[PDB]
Design a protein around this ligand. Sequence first.
Ligand SMILES: [Mg+2]
Ligand SMILES: [Mg+2]
Ligand SMILES: [Mg+2]
Ligand SMILES: [Mg+2]
Ligand SMILES: [Mg+2]
Ligand SMILES: [Mg+2]
Ligand SMILES: [Mg+2]
Ligand SMILES: [Mg+2]
Ligand SMILES: [Mg+2]
Ligand SMILES: [Mg+2]
Ligand SMILES: [Mg+2]
Ligand SMILES: [Mg+2]
Ligand SMILES: [Mg+2]
Ligand SMILES: [Mg+2]
Ligand SMILES: [Mg+2]
Ligand SMILES: [Mg+2]
Ligand SMILES: [Mg+2]
Ligand SMILES: [Mg+2]
Ligand SMILES: [Mg+2]
Ligand SMILES: [Mg+2]
Ligand SMILES: [Mg+2]
Ligand SMILES: [Mg+2]
Ligand SMILES: [Mg+2]
Ligand SMILES: [Mg+2]
Ligand SMILES: [Mg+2]
Ligand SMILES: [Mg+2]
Ligand SMILES: [Mg+2]
Ligand SMILES: [Mg+2]
Ligand SMILES: [Mg+2]
Ligand SMILES: [Mg+2]
Ligand SMILES: [Mg+2]
Ligand SMILES: [Mg+2]
Ligand SMILES: [Mg+2]
Ligand SMILES: [Mg+2]
Ligand SMILES: [Mg+2]
Ligand SMILES: [Mg+2]
Ligand SMILES: [Mg+2]
Ligand SMILES: [Mg+2]
Ligand SMILES: [Mg+2]
Ligand SMILES: [Mg+2]
Ligand SMILES: [Mg+2]
Ligand SMILES: [Mg+2]
Ligand SMILES: [Mg+2]
Ligand SMILES: [Mg+2]
Ligand SMILES: [Mg+2]
Ligand SMILES: [Mg+2]
Ligand SMILES: [Mg+2]
Ligand SMILES: [Mg+2]
Ligand SMILES: [Mg+2]
Ligand SMILES: [Mg+2]
Ligand SMILES: [Mg+2]
Ligand SMILES: [Mg+2]
Ligand SMILES: [Mg+2]
Lengths: 208, 155
Amino acid sequence: GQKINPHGFRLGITTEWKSRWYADKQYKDYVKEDVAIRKLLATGLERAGIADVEIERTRDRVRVDIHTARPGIVIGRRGTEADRIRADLEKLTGKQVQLNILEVKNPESQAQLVAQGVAEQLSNRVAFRRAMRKAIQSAMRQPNVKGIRVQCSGRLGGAEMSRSEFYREGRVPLHTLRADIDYGLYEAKTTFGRIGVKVWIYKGDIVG
Amino acid sequence: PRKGPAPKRPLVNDPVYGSQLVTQLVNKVLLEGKKSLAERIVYGALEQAREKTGTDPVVTLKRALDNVKPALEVRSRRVGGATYQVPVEVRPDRSTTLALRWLVNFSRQRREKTMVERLANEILDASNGLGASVKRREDTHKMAEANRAFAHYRW
RNA sequence: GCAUUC
RNA sequence: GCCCGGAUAGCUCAGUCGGUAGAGCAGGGGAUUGAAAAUCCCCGUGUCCUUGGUUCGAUUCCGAGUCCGGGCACCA
RNA sequence: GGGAGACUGGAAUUCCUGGUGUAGCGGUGGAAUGCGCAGAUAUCAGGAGGAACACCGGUGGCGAAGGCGGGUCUCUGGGCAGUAACUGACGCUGAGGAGCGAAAGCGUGGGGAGCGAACAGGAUUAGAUACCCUGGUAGUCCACGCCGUAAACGGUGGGUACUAGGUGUGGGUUUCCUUCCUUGGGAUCCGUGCCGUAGCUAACGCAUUAAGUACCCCGCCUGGGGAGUACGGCCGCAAGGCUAAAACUCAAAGGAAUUGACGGGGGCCCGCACAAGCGGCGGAGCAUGUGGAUUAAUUCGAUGCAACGCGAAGAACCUUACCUGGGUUUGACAUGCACAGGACGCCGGCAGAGAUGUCGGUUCCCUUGUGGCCUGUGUGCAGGUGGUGCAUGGCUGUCGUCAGCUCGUGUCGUGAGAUGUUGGGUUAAGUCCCGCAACGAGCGCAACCCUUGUCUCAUGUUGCCAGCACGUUAUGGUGGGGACUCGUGAGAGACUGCCGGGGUCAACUCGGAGGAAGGUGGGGAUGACGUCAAGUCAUCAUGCCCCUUAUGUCCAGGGCUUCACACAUGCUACAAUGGCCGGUACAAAGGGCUGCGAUGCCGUGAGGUGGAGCGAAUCCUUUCAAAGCCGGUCUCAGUUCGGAUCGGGGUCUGCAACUCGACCCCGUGAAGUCGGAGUCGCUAGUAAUCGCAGAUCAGCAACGCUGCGGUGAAUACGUUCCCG
RNA sequence: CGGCCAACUACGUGCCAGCAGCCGCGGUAAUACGUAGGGUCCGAGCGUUGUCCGGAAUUACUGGGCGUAAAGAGCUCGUA
Ligand SMILES: [Mg+2]
Ligand SMILES: [Mg+2]
Ligand SMILES: [Mg+2]
Ligand SMILES: [Mg+2]
Ligand SMILES: [Mg+2]
Ligand SMILES: [Mg+2]
Ligand SMILES: [Mg+2]
Ligand SMILES: [Mg+2]
Ligand SMILES: [Mg+2]
Ligand SMILES: [Mg+2]
Ligand SMILES: [Mg+2]
Ligand SMILES: [Mg+2]
Ligand SMILES: [Mg+2]
Ligand SMILES: [Mg+2]
Ligand SMILES: [Mg+2]
Ligand SMILES: [Mg+2]
Ligand SMILES: [Mg+2]
Ligand SMILES: [Mg+2]
Ligand SMILES: [Mg+2]
Ligand SMILES: [Mg+2]
Ligand SMILES: [Mg+2]
Ligand SMILES: [Mg+2]
Ligand SMILES: [Mg+2]
Ligand SMILES: [Mg+2]
Ligand SMILES: [Mg+2]
Ligand SMILES: [Mg+2]
Ligand SMILES: [Mg+2]
Ligand SMILES: [Mg+2]
Ligand SMILES: [Mg+2]
Ligand SMILES: [Mg+2]
Ligand SMILES: [Mg+2]
Ligand SMILES: [Mg+2]
Ligand SMILES: [Mg+2]
Ligand SMILES: [Mg+2]
Ligand SMILES: [Mg+2]
Ligand SMILES: [Mg+2]
Ligand SMILES: [Mg+2]
Ligand SMILES: [Mg+2]
Ligand SMILES: [Mg+2]
Ligand SMILES: [Mg+2]
Ligand SMILES: [Mg+2]
Ligand SMILES: [Mg+2]
Ligand SMILES: [Mg+2]
Ligand SMILES: [Mg+2]
Ligand SMILES: [Mg+2]
Ligand SMILES: [Mg+2]
Ligand SMILES: [Mg+2]
Ligand SMILES: [Mg+2]
Ligand SMILES: [Mg+2]
Ligand SMILES: [Mg+2]
Ligand SMILES: [Mg+2]
Ligand SMILES: [Mg+2]
Ligand SMILES: [Mg+2]
C-alpha cells in the first residue's frame, strides 16, 4: 500500500470535492442516497464514458452533473436516456433531479477516460503494450499535459503469473502537493479475471 | 553522539540556599516529576543537618561531596576475549554526578523512617567519612589501583 | 579466545 | 557343583554409622537463535532385586530365594 | 654464491664445571602441564660439541635444469667481449637410449647443538586422534650407495631470421666533450627487468627475453568421471616409479570475463546500535490475545522481525460466519419469460420455544388496453462468511522515510555490460561544489500543504473586562466598553540574509550580532525502482472449481467466555518520595436530539424522582481535573501496605444479565518483601508520573485504541565492543 | 503438428496414466500425455529398429591445437 491516492492527498489544496452540500442531521441519509445514485450511474452509461459525477443538494433539489466524453449516448435525440435516468433517479432519491449532462473538453487529457480507453482495449484482447503506448502518445500531444504515467497489473496477456508494468513520459511529481495530478482507475474485465489500469496525468502547478 | 557531544542543559540556582549543587541534588532526588516533593525533601534534610551539626548546611554538603567524589574509575574493555578492567580518570563534572548519585541511592537504602532523615544522616556520615557512599568511593579506587597494570590500554 | 549445521 | 563379590533415578555410578537417599548424562519448562545443535537458568524422577527375621525404627544388621560378574570342579 | 676436495673463523643456542645470588622461572588470547626451591631463571668466567653462516645481500650474479652465499688454499666446468690468426657447412633437432635430477624416504657406518613427523601430557571444545603450550623419537648433518618423484612453473620444447620505441640494471668494447673531474654523453656486442606500438588472443594478457610474422626437428592433446587405476611387463632392498586399458556412468566437465549477493576482507560514514543514564519486562494477582488441550460447537482469518489489547471503533439475544433441534423451499433478497387471479398488505385472536401455522376484522388505481401488485403455480434463475491470496483486481505491511533507483542520446567492449552514478571535498540527503567521455533528463531528496512558537492589520457574540455606571449575599451578574486576552480571516517573519575566521574568492563550515525563533526552528502529512509467490477470495470485486432440497434460508437454545498447562501485550501491587481523613489551587482537547441533562427533593452509595436550559464559544458534560500545596493521623508491622477471591444485600440498561454485563454498599482479606538466565523503551517538554475526552456503543468484559493537557528528570567521554 | 522442423485448437485425466532423438513435457485451467476437429509432409506406400557415410575443421593431407580451456618430457647429451 505504497502510494497515497493522488486525489485525496491534494483534496484540500489542488482538487475539490465531487459533491457539495451541508447537513448536520441528514448527513448519514445524504451519503446513503449518494451511494445509491453513483452505483446507479456507474452501471448505466458504461459505454458512454463517464469521468466525473458531482452531486449538489439543498432542500429537495438534487442537481446531478455527469461529465462524459460524448453526451450523444447519454441523451437520445428524443431525450430517451435522460428520461429513463431521471425516472430511476427521482424514484430512488425521492425528490426532483435536474440531470445537467455535460461533456469533457479534452477527452484524452482526462485520466479517468484514458483509463477507460486502455481498459476497453484490453477487454478486446489488444496487446497491452499497444494500448499503453497509444494512451501515452494521445495525452502528451494535448497542450496542458506535461507528463503521464500509465500502469496495468494483473494476468496480462492471459498469463498465469501476475505482471505489473508501467510506462512513463515526462514529469509525474506525485510527492508535490501543488502539482496538479489527475488520477484515474478502471478495472478491465477479461476471460482470466480483472486487470487494473491506473493513469496519472500531470497538467502543471496550481498556486492559490 | 556519533556526530559529537551534545549541549548540557543550564541548571538554575537554588532560591533558598543559592548553591547550584543543591538543585542538582534535588534533580537526583526527583521521582516521577514531583519536583516540589523532592525540593522539600532536600530542604528538610539540610535543616536536619543544620540542627545536628550547628554549622551551615551547604558547607557540610560540599564537604560530604568532596569525601565521596571518585577521582579514578574502572571501565571494562574486552581485549582478546579476556575482559580487562581499565583505570580511567574521572572528569570533574562526572565526579560530582557520581558522588551525588551515590549519596541519594544509599540514602534510599538507609534504615531511618523517612527520606529526610535518611538523606541528612548520610550527608553527615559522609562529611565525617563514615558512610556507605564513602566506602563505595574507596572500593572504586581499590579496583582502579588493582588494575593499574591495564592502564596501558589508555582507552 | 570461541562461533557446528540448514 | 564349591568359595567370593554384586543387584540404588530412564542409563552409567557414589552412599551406609540402624534415624540419609545423593552425582554426571537423559527427560520437562524457560532463555539464547531466522531455525536446529552447543551453551545458560529454573524443575521433576527411588519396594534401594525379591523374601521373611531381629529392632521403636532396615538401602544399611542376619538367614533364604532369583538373576549376574569373578576364582575353582583336581590325582590316578 | 658454477662444481669438487682439504683446512680453518666468529656470533648465537644447548650442555658441563666453578663463582655471585635468590624464589621464582617458563608459557598464552587467557591458562595449565613443565622447570625450580636438593639452589632454577638471571649474571660472570672457563670448557665441550653440533649445525647454520648476521651485516655485504638486490625482484643483483653464476649454472642445462635441480641448484649455488663465513674465509683461505688446491683441482676443475661454462660464459662474454675484442682480434680475424685457423678449419671450410664440420650445422639444427633428435624416436628409442644414457646421464644429471629439490625435499621426503631407504641401506650400512659415523654424528647428533638447535629444530622436529610419530609419540606423550596441558589447554580449547559438544568431541579435539587438530590449530595453541610443555616435552620429545626417527629425521634434519657427514661418508658411500639406492630411490627418480614436486605447482621439478615462465603452468610457455629446442634452433634460426625478421617486425615502433621509451626506460632501469649486470658484463665487455669503442667515439666525442674535456675539466680530462668522470653515473659526461653517443655508438656497439652479450645478459636481466619494467612500460608500451604494430600484430596476435575467448578474454585475461603477450608484445625484439612474443603468446607477433615464418621455416626445420622433437614431445604431447582429442568431453567429464571410472583412472594415471586394474591386468601384464620392466625397474626398486622397500616405499613405490614407469608403461597403461575396458566395462560402466553423466550432459556435461571446463577457460575468461560481467552484474549482483555474501565474507569470522579492507576503507570511510550513519541509527537509543552500543556506551552514559532513567524507567520497565522475565517473579505475584488480575485483564486481554494466542499456542496447546478439551468440546456437540469451542466459526474463520493472522501466526520470526513484519502473528499474538492483531481483523473486533464494543460476542447476553442480535451480531454469528459455528453446534443441537425445529422449520422452509423460485426461496430471507433480484429480474426476464409462461399460466391462472383480484387483491397484496395490514390489524388483532388462539396453538407453538420461536420460526411459523390457522381463524376473525380490514382491502386498489387508469379504463378495458392495460398498469402497480401479488393470490401464486411454474421455468430461466437467485443465494453460498463453500474452495483456491500459489489464478487475480483493489487495499495494506515490510526492508526503510533508507538515499537510493533508472532512462534518452553519445562513447568504450566480440559480448553480458560499462560510462554517466567513479575520484577529491561537502551535506540530514545521488545535498551541492570542483574536476571528469560524457552531455542531459526522470522517479526519489528538498520545497509547496497542516499544526505549534512571534508580531501586524481587520473584527466584538455565545468570547474578553481595563476605564466609567447599576447589582450581588454568588458570578461579566447587568448597563455598557476595543482597551487587554481569545476566537478566525488576511499578512509579515528564517534567507547562512548580515558580520569575523576557516576554506579551490568553491560547495560548505565554526563562531558572533539582531530577533519570538538559527541554521532543513519543533512535530504531522508525504513510502522512489523493487523485495518478501508477505497479508487479505471473510469489507468489496473477480477467473476457474464446487453446493442448489442443500455447503442456500428463517428461528429457539447453546457456543465463540471451556482449562492440567505454555507464550505474548498490559494493569494493580509489594508501601512512608507512602496509605487514610479534612481543607484548598491551577488545564487542554472533545461530545450531545426519540440525545446531553442543571436546581431541588429522596437514598450511605450506585442511583431514583422530576425536568430548567441547550442542535449549543450561549446550556449540560459541577462554577469542568488529578498529581500538587497546607494540616492532622498511621510508624516499618504482610501492616491503617495490597485488593485477588469468596458470602450477603442492591442499582441500571435490556424482551431477557444462569452459562455471560457494568456499577454500588456490607463483610471477607489471597499471592505479593522489587522478581533467575535473559530482555525492552527513551536524547527534552523526551522518559517517568497524573488525570481528562472521544470513536464503537441499549448496556458494557476498556486495564485496549485514538487523542488532550498538568507536573517534569538523568545522561551522551566516545565509536574499542554487540545489532542494522 | 513445443524448438530444430512444414503444420493449433477443444475435451479427458493433474508428477498419475503416459510422452521423449536432445533440451525437456504430466502437480485438477497441458499447442509435449490420450482422444476429436482441423492442419502439414509423403503416397501404394508411410513409419520404426539396425547398419555405414555426412553434418563432425570432432584424428584437421586438403583442414585443428598445447601460458590460464585437454595438451611442452624435470633438465641435458646423443644413436637411427
Ligand atoms: Mg548433520
Ligand atoms: Mg593329570
Ligand atoms: Mg663431500
Ligand atoms: Mg651455576
Ligand atoms: Mg647460566
Ligand atoms: Mg640432441
Ligand atoms: Mg625422448
Ligand atoms: Mg634428503
Ligand atoms: Mg621407516
Ligand atoms: Mg639415513
Ligand atoms: Mg644411522
Ligand atoms: Mg610441538
Ligand atoms: Mg642417480
Ligand atoms: Mg610429473
Ligand atoms: Mg624450483
Ligand atoms: Mg609441466
Ligand atoms: Mg620458438
Ligand atoms: Mg637487452
Ligand atoms: Mg607490453
Ligand atoms: Mg594462446
Ligand atoms: Mg581420472
Ligand atoms: Mg601406478
Ligand atoms: Mg602390477
Ligand atoms: Mg545500555
Ligand atoms: Mg506478564
Ligand atoms: Mg514482574
Ligand atoms: Mg482462533
Ligand atoms: Mg498494539
Ligand atoms: Mg450469539
Ligand atoms: Mg501474495
Ligand atoms: Mg493464509
Ligand atoms: Mg554503473
Ligand atoms: Mg547506485
Ligand atoms: Mg561526475
Ligand atoms: Mg536529487
Ligand atoms: Mg519530502
Ligand atoms: Mg503466500
Ligand atoms: Mg466466493
Ligand atoms: Mg440465534
Ligand atoms: Mg475470541
Ligand atoms: Mg488499603
Ligand atoms: Mg507471603
Ligand atoms: Mg515491608
Ligand atoms: Mg533520535
Ligand atoms: Mg460506551
Ligand atoms: Mg502527556
Ligand atoms: Mg513451423
Ligand atoms: Mg572428418
Ligand atoms: Mg554420426
Ligand atoms: Mg580444437
Ligand atoms: Mg608451440
Ligand atoms: Mg590445462
Ligand atoms: Mg619445460
